[PDB]
Symmetry: D2
Subunit: 359 residues, 4 copies
């Protein structure tokens, strides 16, 4: 017959002519050569989350390269200056950068990428939950092993093997942590009692960083570079266990949240611009983004996480939700990559931080 | 031709005869009648997450009905006794029950289901992040409104409308919270200074529950029933904001984590059995499950959350991972429902808690 | 000191006064009674996906109750008339309804809810992938059993036990299917050869429905009610296996896609309005939504699935994407519930289809 | 006091000493240099999905390098020989390789990586849904543009702009496709009528590949290298639309599934070993894995997809489920990467296919 006219008209509508960029991947070379830099450059034009990874690289580079001319009479406010450690290259920046990491990222090999950022003061403030605090120190005492996601936990428990995803922390590691930290907690309580020291999570994490005295440790580098590290639920993990058992041997330690919320929420107020790089969700994400409401919004933003907004969670909220709160500025152009961080962070570092440090 | 013999042999293997239950849904009645009780009863045999919901109902009923005969010379250790509020039905239990909730569940209408559990002391300890603490009190001052997931946050911010998923909290609600809480913080600091009171998150949440003095509030009922509520990152939210601004008007408040980790981790040690019901992930999940390591494992367990274990997160970890740590006992038969809680909790309550209370 | 003025101004902005509905859950009764109808009624005001479930119930009720006055000279075009089966209640409708289901929903106990809809001609066209076609017939020969998600597949294979999620299909079930279907395929090929019959997936599924001749079967009811069932990849499953082995014993069967794409894409063109209810994603979702482009868009739409749009997949695309294509009309108000269907479909049926049938 | 002895004993259990590999990331160089090869090499030891990506690279390299000594009297059965195109490097292999791709991967820039594999006959059989068939040809006529996930579909439709995730296909592209394909369908129907040609999806896709006659096209290279391409729902997309409208101008085309299920399910039976690389889920995943049941299982397997098994879907099923069916051999060591393919495929190619081609 003749096809229905409504179908013809609906399937074959006219379209606007577009001048936007085109979708195009990197073409691997016909001789087997593989150009990683062209691969990385084309991610922005590959679509779906590869495109968001490219936009996130762009966003971090805007943080690293932001500059301005101070108002008459003002001096320039700079960040990333470092703690003057011999031989360590630092690069001053006009944008202050906050890093949030979930604890499992320190369990993973991302620890080595994060350490690189903190060693060179390429971020200025870190928020990390308690697991990521303690496991950085524990890794200076004993390693975490490769395992598998599907191995019966009954068998692991009978062997004293604690599972974190497809990783294994033998429980002996925590006995070694106990041996290391108990004399430090004794000294901290002695200083509280005799010198009036008022402990908070950030002050304790600074002290533990100096104590571990080991260049393999992220929080050692944070302490050496005077990078504050906040962790308002610092007792939610093995450090909490150590505080628990310590307190029956030596009672009276106080760990205060109030001083640390003053200090955290004041962190974004001096800088001309702030950038936030949030790897994972939960407390570290809300703590950083809420602090940035105090300056009427973060100016540059990257989220990388596996959450989605359909459950109403803070973890899953899009950057757009944070705009409604004032936690992201009205002028920002934020980026979320929907991905597991171990697949993403290495290429983010290659495309932004490392290139910047090489200038 | 003749089909390949390897294909014949591989496609048509013999099978073992099984005596396990059969998959079978509820058959709605041909006249339009719908029997919700038969619907609920058949979930266990429907497959996929409906089956897990049925198993979770079974698991909670095992918590509610667990009983034992004390050893010679011992008395029976009971829970769920309540605070003797007039007219309120309570039901003593030999299993102690921990409830963990993410903050957004209090933003949602799940607040009414959770309030029911706390009012009747059908749970004994709650862990809830700061958002769920404050928004329960705020809802006694002003309501949260229905919105949508896709409404530009630039427009919302210009209108002072804070978005939580598809919900809206007008910022005026937080000004009302400020008016309500500032005199309380003044009094708490006065008691710290003159009576030596040592504030912790759980002690403060108890006090705020009594202060709101309103039967619509979950944490009012927790305080009246002497149900401890822990929240180790209590500053990660609007209460943190209020503490911040209060502290410039009236400095010196201390909010201690150490006493609260002693108290939290001792909560599981008296009971003959413990059950854990964890709605959502993050801090509330780790805090409860880790506490239960101190008794060598929780005995009954239900998780309901939208996370998955592939990212190595604590939120996404299966119950099997907690077994490896000793946080779930070797003899437990735990259940996870992979689902958004607002779709699940009402039917869990119908199938377990409500039926129990009606006995 | 004095708190920073920028922080004061940013945290305490003024807000617009709102007249939108309020978030409010159902309050279970203090004596243990549980009112499922009030539970269901309040889902719309509970937030997150409970709200979307309430909106989806509303959307389906709009399909079931849509009515109009024909233009002068026209008669009213009605659907849901049924096939005149004795004793079966039917309810004519002016909105034509398409149902899409993934194969695993027939493996599950949702088979009983879907059968209810098809028996009463509460939907007019179904699209279902091959697994859901064959397993409906197989369940008339032998049942599917309950199993578990975590049981080593090496052990299951050695026992001839095929796993579908937490369900088990003993391989003997497929040998029984072979015995049942081979004489039918013989007859179909005989009719092709002697009567010129031109087989398509929808024509074959109709024939298999009549052959099974069993009121337990969804596709039996579809055939009796002259509900077309499309499945353009009908060979992607056990029916494909049976066609394969049959063809070496008796070659020449032809199964044509061309006639079936004419017939599928013409299905939406007569009705005054169309509604689409898509349970799961993949082929069934694209096939139905694309067909509705031929009328310039579906008028009412519900999606229920576990996919997300971040991967660019057709499965994960929001209704908004289908609007851009013309597959959903510009005036529609579509609804997606982000959830596993076994947790959702029973309450959708209770709130819409069953209530409608009871009128 | 003294800490409870049960807590001491439970928190500080003894652990087995392990000899398994250690978690360790790549350490970016302190001068800003970034070694992509060491990055890639360390993924296996980074944890979570980076580890699975490393294992997937290993699995593909096992496919590419598998070799064997034929039994006495047999000759070696080889694959990847190519179609003798001048200048194109091919590498014979004893393992036959199946590639499955969802349609959106051809919409994306992954088209360029996939084309590389097909051009060099580094895979032997492809299964791709209809969207990925047509959009490869359409891209030879007009490009796909970059867009965004959040742009109102009402506005896009009024402009004739079809959205695929964050990509845009102007509808004019489909009018150009119509102009290109209608004379081909005319000729195919002429050959059916005058020469008895029996069209199937794979035979049509071969013909369209030769017709486009363009080295930018994946399916051109498949046809030139005699790589069969299966697509049992080939009408589920724009090719289906074109067949629809063509059939009213020129009726009688038949597109048969039966011959194509014989041919697909026979593809795995000759090779000494088979490997399956499945990018995305749905039909392409089931079609390939089910075919491999016919040889009693695939020997090497990589899945990369964003699905999870909790919904019982075929898309979300772990490799372990396919073992239960016999679709994966009992001796295989399969790998799934839980990730969006655009973030994963480039590094899979760099680590396996490209290195292999360079030998
Ligand atoms: N994970 C550990 O190693 C460990 C150890 C001890 C204590 N804990 C405690 O558990 C509690 C909760 O842990 P948490 O705050 O680190 O967050 P979490 O593990 O609850 O994760 C929060 C969300 O962040 C996202 N996320 C997590 N890992 C991701 C990844 N690799 N890639 C992308 N997104 C990811 C996910 O959406 C997840 O749901 C903390 O208080 C922590 O101290 C954790
Ligand atoms: N959400 C709010 O209303 C709000 C308000 C103020 C502050 N905050 C703060 O954000 C921080 C993180 O929030 P959080 O600890 O409540 O958890 P979260 O929002 O980070 O969620 C943790 C994980 O729990 C799961 N989850 C969340 N909601 C779920 C749901 N409805 N159904 C099933 N699973 C769900 C998800 O996997 C999610 O990734 C807290 O410190 C909180 O105080 C939240
Ligand atoms: N699953 C079986 O029982 C079975 C048996 C034989 C053959 N197959 C074949 O596998 C192929 C692919 O299967 P399919 O088309 O049914 O879809 P699928 O299993 O590939 O699912 C497609 C998407 O739909 C969503 N989905 C699936 N189940 C869901 C659920 N319970 N709740 C919410 N969303 C859900 C998910 O996002 C999933 O990724 C088909 O050709 C089918 O014939 C399946
Ligand atoms: N997507 C298009 O461009 C397009 C165009 C026309 C027609 N269609 C039709 O839609 C139907 C369904 O599409 P489909 O079979 O391609 O699969 P799908 O889009 O239904 O995806 C199936 C599952 O595969 C996984 N997946 C999809 N994209 C992924 C990604 N980038 N990374 C990781 N995992 C991913 C996801 O779990 C998804 O649920 C097909 O018949 C197709 O022809 C699609």
């Amino acid at each position: 017959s003749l096809a229905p006219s409504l179908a013809v008209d609906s399937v074959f509508v006219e379209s606007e002519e577009l001048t936007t960029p085109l979708v195009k991947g990197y073409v691997p070379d016909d001789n087997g050569k593989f150009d990683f830099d062209k691969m990385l450059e084309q991610m922005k034009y590959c679509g779906f989350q590869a495109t968001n990874l490219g936009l996130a690289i762009d966003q971090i580079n805007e943080m690293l390269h932001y500059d301005y001319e101070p108002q008459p009479g003002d001096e320039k406010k700079l960040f990333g200056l470092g703690g003057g450690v011999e031989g360590v290259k630092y690069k001053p920046r006009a944008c202050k950068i906050f890093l949030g990491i979930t604890s499992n990222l320190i369990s993973s090999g991302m620890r080595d990428y994060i350490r690189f950022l903190v060693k060179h003061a390429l971020v200025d403030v870190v928020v990390c939950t308690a697991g990521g605090i303690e496991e950085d120190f524990i890794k200076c005492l004993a390693p975490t092993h490769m395992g598998e996601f599907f191995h019966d936990g009954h068998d692991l428990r009978k062997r004293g093997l604690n599972r974190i995803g497809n990783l294994i922390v033998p429980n002996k590691n925590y006995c070694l942590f106990e041996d290391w930290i108990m004399p430090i907690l004794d000294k901290c309580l002695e200083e509280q009692n005799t010198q009036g020291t008022k402990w908070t999570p950030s002050k304790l994490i600074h002290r533990l960083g100096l104590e571990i005295n080991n260049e393999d440790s992220v929080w050692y580098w944070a302490a050496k570079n005077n990078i504050p590290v906040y962790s308002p639920a610092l007792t939610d993990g093995s450090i909490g266990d150590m505080i628990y058992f310590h307190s029956y041997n030596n009672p009276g330690l106080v760990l205060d949240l109030v001083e640390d919320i003053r200090d955290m929420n004041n962190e974004p107020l001096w800088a001309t611009k702030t950038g936030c790089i949030i790897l994972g969700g939960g407390v570290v994400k809300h703590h950083i983004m809420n602090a940035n409401l105090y300056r009427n919004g973060a100016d540059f933003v990257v989220y990388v996480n596996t959450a989605h907004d359909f459950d109403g969670s803070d973890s899953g909220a899009r950057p757009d939700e944070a705009v409604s709160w004032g936690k992201i500025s009205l002028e920002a152009k934020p980026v979320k990559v929907y991905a597991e961080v171990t697949l993403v962070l290495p290429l983010l570092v290659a495309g932004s931080f490392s290139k910047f440090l090489a200038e």
